């Protein structure tokens, strides 16, 4: 069961609101493993508060380092589980166009496109 599956919409709307009261600048990002992934390590945490000046490239490096991937290992971060957005895009721009109706930004990571 994913975060969307185990937390009601109404509760998630409230979560976003609680987060923004404490962190008016940060982008709330849900980062989950693709359900068919068997190769990448499992990230220990799923909920990330990301400064609004970070770009996708920087976020990708941050997650790869947290997974302690070697430079040779493959890693993709799919926004909304499908959209491949340019790695140069600032996260605030990703948030503005790809955020969910509940106000969270959803990503899935895997070894494939």
């Amino acid at each position: 069961k994913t975060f969307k599956q185990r937390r009601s919409f109404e509760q998630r709307v409230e979560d976003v609101r609680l987060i923004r009261e404490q962190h008016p600048t940060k982008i709330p990002v849900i980062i989950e493993r693709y359900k068919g992934e068997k190769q990448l390590p499992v990230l220990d945490k799923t909920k990330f508060l990301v400064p609004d000046h970070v770009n996708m490239s920087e976020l990708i490096k941050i997650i790869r380092r947290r997974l302690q991937l070697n430079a040779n290992q493959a890693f993709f971060l799919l926004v909304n589980g499908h959209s491949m957005v340019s790695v140069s895009t600032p996260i605030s721009e990703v948030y503005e166009s790809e955020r969910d109706e509940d106000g969270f930004l959803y990503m899935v990571y895997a070894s494939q496109e």
């Binding site: 987060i19 962190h23 940060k26 709330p28 945490k45 909920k47 990330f48 508060l49 990301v50 400064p51 970070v54 770009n55 996708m56 490239s57 920087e58 976020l59 490096k61 941050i62 380092r65 947290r66 790695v87 140069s88 895009t89 600032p90």
Partner: peptide
């Protein structure tokens, strides 16, 4: 009560900004 939310730190952002490959917007 335990923290739910990882605050991505300035240290890890700066480590990622100091690694190639560097992406340039505009």
């Amino acid at each position: 009560v335990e923290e739910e939310w990882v605050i991505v730190s300035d240290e890890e952002i700066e480590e990622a900004r100091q690694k190639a490959p560097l992406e340039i917007t505009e």
